[PDB]
Structure 1
């Protein structure tokens, strides 16, 4: 649902997709479980709400609702950068200094009706006064 603050009404959902670097069977068993754990922890750190998270052997698909203060690029790099540091630190057998490739996919999600927009306008005028 739409979230609010003193001066903002928002609903920002994004699909983030990225892949491990060397092998397609990287995120499995304990590695995959820890990856899910750290991504969840990073989400709460950023005040984000995970809608759905697929941690597959060869890719991650993170669908999350986030505060408007964050740029998609900032979020992608925070999730990828911090998770990589933690995951590589925990599993020594994981190769090289990089876990993820530098690329990622991001797509906004949502459908705003004319009714939602009209309601918002009327609420602001009711609030601010005419």
Structure 2
């Protein structure tokens, strides 16, 4: 049986692998800065109705595995996740301005991949 969420006019299962990097690929996401970023990203995610299945912060990039509804558009939540986290991180960690004084904490691009929650076998069963 397929894992499926139900909403008003749709049944769905939507997961994405989202990834982005620190501007200039600076390795600044370490220690308390990485810990903070985890809080900030979870708060933004919940504020936006996103479920964070997995989160991993490496020094120069972030990897998220998200579960969403059909109404949450990609450019919208990526903007929330990155734009708001940049704003907060700079406030909470003024020391970031030492390596990133240009007004950006993040690389201006994101990489995103859809993800199958269920197996190909489960899908053919449901689809047949």
TM-score, length of structure 1 as denominator length: 0.83
Q: What aligned pairs does 1:99-114 form with structure 2 within 5 A after superposition? A: 99-110=105-116, 111=118, 113-114=123-124
Partner of residue 124, structure 1: none
Q: What aligned pairs does 1:62-73 form with structure 2 within 5 A after superposition? A: 62-73=64-75
Match for residue 115 of structure 1 among 102, 111, 125: 125
What does the per-residue CA deviation read over 1:83-123, in whole Å, with 9 as the maximum and x for residues that have no partner?
111111111121222100111100000156133245xxxxx
Partner of residue 41, structure 2: 39
Partner of residue 3, structure 1: 5
Based on CA coordinates, which of the two structures has the bigger radius of gyration? Answer: 1
| 2:17 and 2:66 in contact (8 A); partners too | yes
Cα separation, 1, equivalents of 2:92 and 2:29: 13
The alignment's C-alpha RMSD in Å is 1.5
| 2:23 and 2:108 in contact (8 A); partners too | no
What does the per-residue CA deviation read over 1:2-43, in whole Å, with 9 as the maximum and x for residues that have no partner?
111122111110011000113532100110000000111111
Note the C-alpha offset of 1:81.
Answer: 0.5
Q: Which runs of 4+ in 1 moved over 4 A?
A: none
1:58 aligns with 2:60: yes
Aligned residues: 118
Q: What runs of 5+ residues in structure 1 fail to find an aligned partner?
A: 119-130
